[PDB]
From Swiss-Prot:
This is Non-structural protein 3. It is a peripheral membrane protein. In the N-terminus, the macro domain displays a mono-ADP-ribosylhydrolase activity. The central part called, the alphavirus unique domain (AUD) has a zinc-binding function. The C-terminus region, also called hypervariable domain (HVD), is mainly disordered and binds several host proteins. This intrinsically disordered domain contains 2 SH3 domain-binding sites and 2 FGDF motifs necessary and sufficient for the formation of nsP3/G3BP complexes. It comes from Chikungunya virus (strain S27-African prototype) (CHIKV). Changing residue 117 to A: Partial loss of mono-ADP-ribosylhydrolase activity; complete loss of ADP-ribose 1'' phosphate phosphatase activity. ADP-D-ribose binds at residues 13, 27, 35, 115-117. Changing residue 27 to A: Partial loss of mono-ADP-ribosylhydrolase activity; complete loss of ADP-ribose 1'' phosphate phosphatase activity. Phosphorylated by host on serines and threonines. It is found in: Host cytoplasmic vesicle membrane. Residues 4-163 form the Macro domain. It comes from the Viruses. Interacts with mRNA-capping enzyme nsP1. Interacts (via C-terminus) with host G3BP1; this interaction inhibits the formation of host stress granules on viral mRNAs and the nsp3-G3BP1 complexes bind viral RNAs and probably orchestrate the assembly of viral replication complexes. Interacts (via C-terminus) with host G3BP2; this interaction inhibits the formation of host stress granules on viral mRNAs and the nsp3-G3BP2 complexes bind viral RNAs and probably orchestrate the assembly of viral replication complexes. Interacts (via C-terminus) with host NAP1L1.
Amino acid sequence: GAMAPSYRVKRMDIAKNDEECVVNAANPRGLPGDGVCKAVYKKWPESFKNSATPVGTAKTVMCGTYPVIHAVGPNFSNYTESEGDRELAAAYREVAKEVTRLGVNSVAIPLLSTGVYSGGKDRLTQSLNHLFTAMDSTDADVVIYCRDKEWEKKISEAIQMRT
Ligand SMILES: [Cl-]
Ligand SMILES: [Cl-]
Ligand SMILES: [Cl-]
């Protein structure tokens, strides 16, 4: 575990993370995809061997010894708000199980279902709160990655609010 488990946020490419493992915002088919998924495919392509997994699940594949946790959030274009919300919460719970199982002291994590899978809605708070619900019981240092300057400020505020 981390000596004093923390949350932090950085605005940069998660492919350049300084953590012991990465969470991919994957698609169910293990395809290269777009956004975080395409960055992850360029950096750790070996981790896409048999990475296909259903919505609401996470599947870890090692790139060398570096674990890539493929977490499949729902595409809110296809899911109802209710069912999507359930699957988005479930994906993060499966991430927390994998992070625990791996024994890592740190994990780089994007906000699932906030990009192409957001169905055109701002889901920062929804996705971040499901991240916290899952990860709060873990003792890994969590570093959240984002690309937008206003998102960085809002995520940072949310982290600082809980102290
Ligand atoms: Cl960058
Ligand atoms: Cl997305
Ligand atoms: Cl972002």
